[PDB]
Amino acid sequence: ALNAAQEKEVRALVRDTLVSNPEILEEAIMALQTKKADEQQAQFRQALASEHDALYNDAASPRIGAKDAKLVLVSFTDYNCPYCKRFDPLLEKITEQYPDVAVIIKPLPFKGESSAKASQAVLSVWKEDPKAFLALHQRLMQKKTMLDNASIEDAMKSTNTSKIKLTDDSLKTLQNNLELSRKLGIQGTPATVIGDTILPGAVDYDQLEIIVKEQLAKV
Amino acid sequence: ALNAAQEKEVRALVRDTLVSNPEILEEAIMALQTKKADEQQAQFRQALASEHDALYNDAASPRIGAKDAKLVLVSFTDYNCPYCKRFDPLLEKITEQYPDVAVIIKPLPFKGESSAKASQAVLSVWKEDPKAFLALHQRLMQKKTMLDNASIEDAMKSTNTSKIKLTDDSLKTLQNNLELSRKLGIQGTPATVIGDTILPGAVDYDQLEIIVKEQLAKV
Amino acid sequence: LNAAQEKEVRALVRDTLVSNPEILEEAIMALQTKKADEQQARQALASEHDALYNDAASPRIGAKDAKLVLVSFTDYNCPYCKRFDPLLEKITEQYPDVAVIIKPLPFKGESSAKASQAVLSVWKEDPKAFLALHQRLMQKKTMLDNASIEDAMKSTNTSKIKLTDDSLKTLQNNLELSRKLGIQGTPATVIGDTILPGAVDYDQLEIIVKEQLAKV
């Protein structure tokens, strides 16, 4: 053992050490990144059921894939999130390889104004010209640099959506995405809803393919 | 209480433990998501506790399944609700496949006049002749268009309950269900209490099996 | 100290966190403000001068006394990074006055963090072997996994080198760095006072390097 008083001082040092040096946390996160484990969460079934219509029946939420689809994934993502930029082509590839599968995008504004603006832009484009959304979506994901208004205008120009107005209705959609994320325990991106579980972060295509196939099976 | 060299060393052992063993972090994350999920559900669970006798001990509320079941679902349903019609067979299937599980029906007058009349009919049947309840319950639930005077009467004719009087007392039980739905936050049908969670809509058999199995284990 | 007590501290770290998730929620909050403190889209590369150019743990391709040092933020699993790396190398080959520092990033997932651990670990212990492993991992056309990484390290005489936990500290520093410079994707190359935001034609790259080299 060790002094019953020393025990409680170690417990406090665990708290003070982590909160004061978040690089410790971020390195621990880096360490967890090297472990190939899907960290699927089932803590939120009730909340997912309770929010079914907000997840899957919101016409303002862009869709990649078939409206006909048998399985719909919900991607909570941020156009400025580096892991998001890399995880999205995997999600896209699922819909290409499994046409029975579609992905609903829920953009989030976590990394600031330009995230909010990009979110606004794609949501607006989706509402006015659904078929032009995917190109703009991809173009934003390809930006290697922190977005700003200039680089968003460029993305819209090179994807012929520059003439589409960013609307106020789209911001209501964005605030829904946010409150919805709040309720599903989603505090980081990318988070992916696949049936009853949430995939709290990005995974390898191999792991994603298996998870889709298992849920695509259940229906 | 603890020297400076050991404070210095407990602090360094925080970083090392977490970075060397990311699994600790993963546990801590799950623990947190569980905390979140539980806190978001606390109001609902308090209500479930407060309305326990109205939920589980009202002899006027019909039951499908063993009176001594280990687990009792509570189905808030409406005979004119088309999703209730798709879902009810799944709830029945659970009692068929899992004899330790029973379902209590809470009929609701949500969709209109014939919803109140249909609820009154099955509640009235249940109390006079419980054995005769289920065939009528099934029959009304099978009807595809909204019920009216004639189809409720035909439903009772084909299930030999036509000669059972629809009581005023049966309406006390109906009003009780309304009260119960308000206090539990049930603002639509179907809704199912399963242990300490509530399914707020129709879900496929598999997803319902998983919740029932899980809640059955915790007993 | 005291090896027995040290065992308990380790188990306390786990039990304290798992039994009180609120500590983790504070810590994430603390991390949030950290990421806020850093994020920023002729600005921040200047502040981050020592991080950029004087990290011993950061691998270098080219002369140690080079007059121009490009900084390559890159990912071993990123196809555009795989195609662009040979071009940055060719620059050092054709312009021995130009060196390239490598900042591996984990953006494309679990193998990217491992590939990054391997090269940073090899650079600390066996710097002579870094370049061979770097090109090897960059020349694989499939997603890295544990097998192809081990296979790549055998081929380059580095299979006896442990992938350290300390190299993750460096990998997290690269994450910090890219936040402060507004680098959200790969490849991205720092050249003088400007950041080249993707894969470009060699001819284009050459022109920019040649001008910055003359600015010195």
Numbering used by the authors:
A (entry chain B), B (entry chain A): 4 to 222
C (entry chain C): 5 to 45, 48 to 222
Reproduce, without paraphrasing, sentences from the article in which this PDB structure was first reported.
The three crystal structures—which we refer to as compact, transitional and extended —reveal an extraordinary range of motion in this protein. Importantly, the compact and transitional structures have multiple protomers in the asymmetric unit that adopt the same overall structures in each case (8 compact trimers, RMSD ∼1.5 Å for 645 Cα; two transitional trimers, RMSD 0.5 Å for 653 Cα) so that crystal symmetry does not appear to impact on the observed conformation. Moreover, the compact and transitional conformations were determined from crystals grown under similar conditions (2.85 M sodium malonate pH 5.8, 20 °C with either 0.1 M cobalt or copper added). Nevertheless, comparison of the eight compact and the two transitional trimers in these two crystal structures, reveals an unprecedented level of conformational re-arrangement (RMSDs>20 Å). In the transitional PmScsC crystal structure, each of the two trimers incorporates protomers in three conformations: compact, extended-like and intermediate. The two compact protomer conformations of the transitional structure are similar to those in the compact crystal structure (RMSD 0.9–1.8 Å for 188 Cα). The two extended-like protomer conformations of the transitional structure are similar to the protomer in the extended crystal structure though they bend at different points in the linker helix, giving rise to somewhat different catalytic domain placements. The two intermediate conformations in the transitional crystal structure have a linker that forms a short β-strand, and positions the catalytic domain directly above the trimerization stalk. The two intermediate PmScsC crystal structures are asymmetric flat triangles with dimensions 105 × 40 × 70 Å3.
